[PDB]
Design a protein around this ligand. Structure first.
Ligand SMILES: *[C@@H](C(=O)N(CC(C)C)NC(=O)[C@H](CC(C)C)NC(=O)[C@H](CC(C)C)NC(=O)OCc1ccccc1)[C@H](O)C(=O)OCC
Ligand SMILES: O=P(O)(O)O[C@H]1[C@H](OP(=O)(O)O)[C@@H](OP(=O)(O)O)[C@H](OP(=O)(O)O)[C@@H](OP(=O)(O)O)[C@H]1OP(=O)(O)O
Ligand code: NA
Length: 202
């Protein structure tokens, strides 16, 4: 897995195939934030957007805090917003992975804050995300008590963004319908494994 998070102008574009089985979503709008230029991450970002295409915006964000919209209409973003951050979790520790798309929890927070400022300045949309869903492999401890997710929710706060964060402690996988799958003890992929996920709130 070659890490590529620099220069968003050089990233591959994406193609979304909307689905009909999407269903309801407690979010009026969402932004799928593609954190690295990796073929898998790109498709998972596209698939997630496809689950609620009409209200999903896909953005590509690099290490300079620069971005570009690669799908959807950011003018329509309004009401309760979600951000699904898509990338590879890497660098294992006693509290599981320590970096998403090559960024530590604190660095990710900074890029996201830089992003928020730019986005609001460009699209004139000062709506902060209501929830953040981290779509990368095991970025919180098994016990859900420590890890990347916990450093992140705190760094985000320190950076002007108070938000709830959902994160998984295990392996993660997005299917063609935009649905998440986690890996359990036996090593088989499953869905709705609540033991493999935690939701951090204020
Ligand atoms: C795991 C990681 O960070 N990560 C990124 C996702 C965006 C969450 N995982 C994947 O890359 C995963 C394979 C890894 C080896 C775990 N692949 C997918 O999620 C992939 C995305 C497609 C849209 C391209 N889907 C996939 O193969 O589907 C599996 C599936 C299909 C159908 C039903 C159920 C499951 C990180 O790299 C890590 O820590 O693991 C390395 C060993
Ligand atoms: O309505 P569902 O089919 O069960 O979809 C849910 C729902 O996502 P949608 O907004 O697309 O419905 C959850 O969103 P929340 O309202 O709970 O925030 C999401 O949880 P995250 O936001 O934490 O991702 C969860 O994903 P997960 O599998 O991680 O629980 C996902 O279920 P699917 O994975 O089946 O889409
Ligand atoms: Na739903």
């Amino acid at each position: 897995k070659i890490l590529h998070n620099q220069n968003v102008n050089s990233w591959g574009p994406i193609t979304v195939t909307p689905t009909t089985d999407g269903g309801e979503t407690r979010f009026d709008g969402q932004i799928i934030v593609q954190m690295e230029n990796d073929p898998v991450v790109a498709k998972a970002a596209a698939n997630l957007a496809g689950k609620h295409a009409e209200s999903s915006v896909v953005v590509q964000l690099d290490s300079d805090g620069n971005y570009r919209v690669v799908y959807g209409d950011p003018s329509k973003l309004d009401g309760k917003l979600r951000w699904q951050l898509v990338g590879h979790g890497r660098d294992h520790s006693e509290t599981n992975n320590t970096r998403l798309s090559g960024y530590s929890a604190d660095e990710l927070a900074v890029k996201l804050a830089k992003f928020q400022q730019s986005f609001n300045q460009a699209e004139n949309i000062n709506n902060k995300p209501d929830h953040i869903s981290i779509v990368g492999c095991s970025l919180v401890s098994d016990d859900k008590q420590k890890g990347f997710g916990h450093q992140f929710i705190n760094a985000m706060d320190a950076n002007g963004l108070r938000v709830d964060v959902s994160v998984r402690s295990s392996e993660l996988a997005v299917d063609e319908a935009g649905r998440k799958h986690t890996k359990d003890a036996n090593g088989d992929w499953v869905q709705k494994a609540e033991n493999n996920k935690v939701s951090l709130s204020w």
